[PDB]
Amino acid sequence: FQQFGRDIADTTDAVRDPQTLEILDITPCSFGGVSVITPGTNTSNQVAVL
C-alpha cells in the first residue's frame, strides 16, 4: 500500500502510476555553471568552454 518516498525536504523520490502500479525513480534535470578558458588577449583571441 506504500505509494512514494520522500527525502529530507519533502522532495519525492518515487511515484506510482494511477493506471499501472509501477515504481518510478525521479531525479532532477541537470544544471550547472559555464566557464570560459581564455589565454591572454595580447597573444590571441581563441577560447574554450567548460
Partner: peptide, 23 residues
Amino acid sequence: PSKRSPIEDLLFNKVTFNGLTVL
C-alpha cells in the same frame, strides 16, 4: 594501489542537490 603510508591509510580509514551543489 595509492602510494600511501600505513599510518596514512589508518588515518583515512578512521574518518567517516536542490539548487545547491558541492565542488
